[PDB]
Design an enzyme around this catalytic site. Sequence first.
Site, mmCIF file in Angstrom:
data_model
loop_
_atom_site.group_PDB
_atom_site.id
_atom_site.type_symbol
_atom_site.label_atom_id
_atom_site.label_comp_id
_atom_site.label_asym_id
_atom_site.label_seq_id
_atom_site.Cartn_x
_atom_site.Cartn_y
_atom_site.Cartn_z
ATOM 1 C CB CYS A 76 -0.942 0.008 1.188
ATOM 2 S SG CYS A 76 -1.894 1.496 1.452
ATOM 3 C CB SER A 131 -0.260 3.854 4.059
ATOM 4 O OG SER A 131 -1.433 4.472 3.557
ATOM 5 C CG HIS A 175 2.625 7.742 2.647
ATOM 6 N ND1 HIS A 175 3.084 8.232 1.455
ATOM 7 C CD2 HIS A 175 1.290 7.876 2.612
ATOM 8 C CE1 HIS A 175 2.041 8.647 0.734
ATOM 9 N NE2 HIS A 175 0.932 8.434 1.438
ATOM 10 C CG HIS A 225 -1.212 -1.176 6.392
ATOM 11 N ND1 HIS A 225 -0.128 -0.748 5.670
ATOM 12 C CD2 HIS A 225 -2.313 -0.673 5.782
ATOM 13 C CE1 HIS A 225 -0.591 0.033 4.690
ATOM 14 N NE2 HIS A 225 -1.925 0.083 4.694
ATOM 15 C CB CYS A 268 -5.223 -1.510 3.502
ATOM 16 S SG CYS A 268 -5.247 0.290 3.430
HETATM 17 N N1 NAJ Z 1 -7.667 6.671 4.493
HETATM 18 C C1 NAJ Z 1 -7.206 5.444 4.552
HETATM 19 O O1 NAJ Z 1 -7.590 4.604 5.349
HETATM 20 C C2 NAJ Z 1 -6.166 5.056 3.529
HETATM 21 C C3 NAJ Z 1 -6.027 3.722 3.126
HETATM 22 C C4 NAJ Z 1 -5.218 3.343 2.137
HETATM 23 C C5 NAJ Z 1 -4.468 4.284 1.509
HETATM 24 N N2 NAJ Z 1 -4.516 5.609 1.926
HETATM 25 C C6 NAJ Z 1 -3.777 6.657 1.213
HETATM 26 O O2 NAJ Z 1 -4.416 6.841 -0.051
HETATM 27 C C7 NAJ Z 1 -3.452 7.309 -0.983
HETATM 28 C C8 NAJ Z 1 -3.457 6.436 -2.252
HETATM 29 O O3 NAJ Z 1 -2.956 5.137 -1.905
HETATM 30 P P1 NAJ Z 1 -2.648 4.132 -3.101
HETATM 31 O O4 NAJ Z 1 -3.821 4.035 -4.006
HETATM 32 O O5 NAJ Z 1 -2.081 2.916 -2.451
HETATM 33 O O6 NAJ Z 1 -1.474 4.961 -3.823
HETATM 34 P P2 NAJ Z 1 -0.871 4.974 -5.286
HETATM 35 O O7 NAJ Z 1 -0.999 3.601 -5.862
HETATM 36 O O8 NAJ Z 1 0.472 5.601 -5.154
HETATM 37 O O9 NAJ Z 1 -1.840 5.908 -6.154
HETATM 38 C C9 NAJ Z 1 -1.761 7.348 -6.119
HETATM 39 C C10 NAJ Z 1 -2.073 7.862 -7.499
HETATM 40 O O10 NAJ Z 1 -2.044 9.283 -7.391
HETATM 41 C C11 NAJ Z 1 -1.520 9.759 -8.596
HETATM 42 N N3 NAJ Z 1 -1.059 11.137 -8.401
HETATM 43 C C12 NAJ Z 1 0.100 11.559 -7.827
HETATM 44 N N4 NAJ Z 1 0.145 12.860 -7.819
HETATM 45 C C13 NAJ Z 1 -0.980 13.309 -8.449
HETATM 46 C C14 NAJ Z 1 -1.490 14.643 -8.778
HETATM 47 N N5 NAJ Z 1 -0.806 15.715 -8.452
HETATM 48 N N6 NAJ Z 1 -2.616 14.679 -9.392
HETATM 49 C C15 NAJ Z 1 -3.368 13.600 -9.693
HETATM 50 N N7 NAJ Z 1 -2.912 12.304 -9.486
HETATM 51 C C16 NAJ Z 1 -1.749 12.235 -8.805
HETATM 52 C C17 NAJ Z 1 -0.405 8.802 -8.962
HETATM 53 O O11 NAJ Z 1 -0.007 8.843 -10.300
HETATM 54 C C18 NAJ Z 1 -1.044 7.456 -8.574
HETATM 55 O O12 NAJ Z 1 -1.691 6.760 -9.651
HETATM 56 C C19 NAJ Z 1 -2.096 7.350 -0.253
HETATM 57 O O13 NAJ Z 1 -1.846 8.648 0.309
HETATM 58 C C20 NAJ Z 1 -2.329 6.388 0.901
HETATM 59 O O14 NAJ Z 1 -1.461 6.638 2.000
HETATM 60 C C21 NAJ Z 1 -5.388 5.971 2.931
HETATM 61 ZN ZN ZN Z 2 -3.111 1.119 3.433
#
Ligand code: NAJ
Ligand code: ZN
Lengths: 374, 374
Positions: free
Chosen positions: B46, B48, B51, B67, B174
């Site tokens: 993920c 996160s 991060h 996770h 997740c």
């Molecule tokens: N709230 C929760 O419980 C929770 C759970 C899981 C993930 N997250 C977060 O959700 C986010 C996405 O996770 P993921 O899907 O695994 O990540 P990921 O697979 O890195 O996807 C992020 C996407 O955002 C795109 N991106 C980057 N910058 C930009 C921009 N400026 N404009 C538009 N698109 C952009 C990027 O190309 C990618 O396809 C991350 O910040 C995680 O930490 C939160």
């Molecule tokens: Zn996650």
Amino acid sequence: STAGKVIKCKAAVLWEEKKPFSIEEVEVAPPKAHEVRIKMVATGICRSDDHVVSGTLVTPLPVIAGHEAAGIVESIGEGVTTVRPGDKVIPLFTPQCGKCRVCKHPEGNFCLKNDLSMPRGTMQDGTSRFTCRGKPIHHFLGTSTFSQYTVVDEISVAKIDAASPLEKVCLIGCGFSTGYGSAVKVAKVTQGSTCAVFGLGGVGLSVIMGCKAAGAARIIGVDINKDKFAKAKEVGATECVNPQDYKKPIQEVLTEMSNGGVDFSFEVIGRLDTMVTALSCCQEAYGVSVIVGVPPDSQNLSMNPMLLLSGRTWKGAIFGGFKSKDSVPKLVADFMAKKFALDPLITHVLPFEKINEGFDLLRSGESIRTILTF
Amino acid sequence: STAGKVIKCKAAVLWEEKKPFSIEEVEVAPPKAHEVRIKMVATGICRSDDHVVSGTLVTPLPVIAGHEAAGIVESIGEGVTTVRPGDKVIPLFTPQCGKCRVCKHPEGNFCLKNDLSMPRGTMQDGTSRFTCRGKPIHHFLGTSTFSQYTVVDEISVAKIDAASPLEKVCLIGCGFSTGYGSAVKVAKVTQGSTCAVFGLGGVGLSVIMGCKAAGAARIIGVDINKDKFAKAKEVGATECVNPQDYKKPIQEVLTEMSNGGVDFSFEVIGRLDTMVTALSCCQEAYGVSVIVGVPPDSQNLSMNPMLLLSGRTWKGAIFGGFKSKDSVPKLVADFMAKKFALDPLITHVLPFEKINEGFDLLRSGESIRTILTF
Ligand SMILES: NC(=O)c1ccc[n+]([C@@H]2O[C@H](COP(=O)([O-])OP(=O)([O-])OC[C@H]3O[C@@H](n4cnc5c(N)[nH+]cnc54)[C@H](O)[C@@H]3O)[C@@H](O)[C@H]2O)c1
Ligand SMILES: [Zn+2]
Ligand SMILES: NC(=O)c1ccc[n+]([C@@H]2O[C@H](COP(=O)([O-])OP(=O)([O-])OC[C@H]3O[C@@H](n4cnc5c(N)[nH+]cnc54)[C@H](O)[C@@H]3O)[C@@H](O)[C@H]2O)c1
Ligand SMILES: [Zn+2]
Ligand SMILES: [Zn+2]
Ligand SMILES: [Zn+2]
């Protein structure tokens, strides 16, 4: 005897920011198609009218302000179908055109014909009905109620009960409906919940009234002016706190008082810092915070989005979320049936000619609502 | 046999920020009262977890991250009633204690026992079950799934269907549940609505899946990586836009495309600027925007509160709003019943020993989910 004629009357003209209103003669044009000319009977002094004076709420000057009012229709323009001469009416500072995507949406109330988001200070046709000293004067929110006569678009007026006491129900045109709806409609306060209300002016007292109507178990009023606490408790606050009394920031105080955060909070002041404080003091996983206060023009707040990620909901609303033309007549009918009280909000009565004394009373902290009679 | 004994096994240890994971032998203590030791079968990568590497998400180091996973119970401590040795389980990075005010609230899921708000990197009892080269190693979110074995508190594990394919249902730990729930539970997307989804990774694709399940008429994917667009359309996007292709800010583009703003928007990236853009592109009177992306540590966004005063709702959530222990078994049952698909999220399947290659695939823009297999 005045239908189709220019009316000369007195109005309170604001020529300049941070100056008294000028009570002087204006010319009020007759209503054009789908316009309504109203003989004003009573108008309240809302803090948003003061925001026009202070430059907090930017709208073109010179202007006739006033938006919380009630009157009697003097004449109707061609094609008006929803009011007639002699009807009691409340001007609607948030219109209800009935045709835009917001008016058609079940929740929406901020009609796309409003003059609040990017004020022009005109009628819907982009012109003014007011002249003073030979100079055109702007409208305010399509209402301009600080005048013996105003002209409004039909989508900015509601017909109300003919037996309405206009010196009371003018408050349904802004401060009561805003506060009460912010609690019952926008936040949807639940029975047994804990609420925090920041700002205990006419709008915040109306929020308290709504929280109590919704069955909240605890309603914590928050104000830096402890003179506001007695009335807040009269209308339903269970306790009041003054941030100036505490070493710690009031969001921490309220979180401790509520054993981990409140269910519902309301910002009813118009400060960026209290909007963030009000969000923070609601429970991080399921709390709801509603912004009611009008912020200073063009200023941004700063906040940590982790406050939302944990589960908080943050929203705001105009006019308590009420669809204005549908809701105002119903609120008047409910008032007439004693479903809520307006007298607790009315602390002072003055003739219209003493409008500047009414603003002095608001600015000193003394008043809640002053009602001006024409 | 391993019950009651220290296990020596392989894990991916992060010794400091911005370094590859170190695959090496750790010692995993046996479970204490109300703890569960799990043999890992599959874990997803993920953003996160990345991060933690980049210092976007602060948690104590050194750490065993991970996770999003599934495995089989190896042993239970005294007093465990909800799982038994041999059960398939998903660790719950958001616990469900069932006793706190959030767990008892109908709409809360961010249990007060979580280790996300104020990360300690321990078990509930404030100690660690992990050592490596004679040093204690922190837990992550009460899960620590980048290990052949972990120990979790009982409130941080759910029993799932014994016939579950763990190399797929680990995503219910997740990314799938987060995105899907953010649409169907947190935003409550409506039939016929227009949605905008910012970020088309595993979580954003799961948001699209939920928007389509809820009957949205239009689902606009937004990503700066146009290689993400094909899969976004496969799972329900009706169109995709790359902000880099436009001279205007994308909130203006999206407002124009939606004839005055979208019904529901989702920030699924983790940038302050896109959180504000996503809020702005939802209809000003009735739009809803949900923050899903984890923001960078300790940074505040800037926004104009008029965006909320007109009527927008802004909220965020952890794990799609799902009460974790109640929801995870039901989501697995629903997957087994073909109610949703997980395969669209899985682009790569690697042995656990290739964890760094899996992170390089994510960082390069080349993967959605890599599943690591033990
Ligand atoms: N709230 C929760 O419980 C929770 C759970 C899981 C993930 N997250 C977060 O959700 C986010 C996405 O996770 P993921 O899907 O695994 O990540 P990921 O697979 O890195 O996807 C992020 C996407 O955002 C795109 N991106 C980057 N910058 C930009 C921009 N400026 N404009 C538009 N698109 C952009 C990027 O190309 C990618 O396809 C991350 O910040 C995680 O930490 C939160
Ligand atoms: Zn996650
Ligand atoms: N959203 C809407 O449709 C709508 C409608 C009506 C009014 N308003 C706004 O709502 C706000 C309240 O209006 P009102 O009730 O007429 O005003 P008011 O009577 O001036 O009441 C504001 C109260 O806030 C108190 N206050 C000032 N600073 C602080 C502080 N730092 N902490 C705690 N309390 C403080 C102050 O003492 C006073 O009692 C104003 O900003 C109005 O412009 C918005
Ligand atoms: Zn309208
Ligand atoms: Zn007002
Ligand atoms: Zn709990």
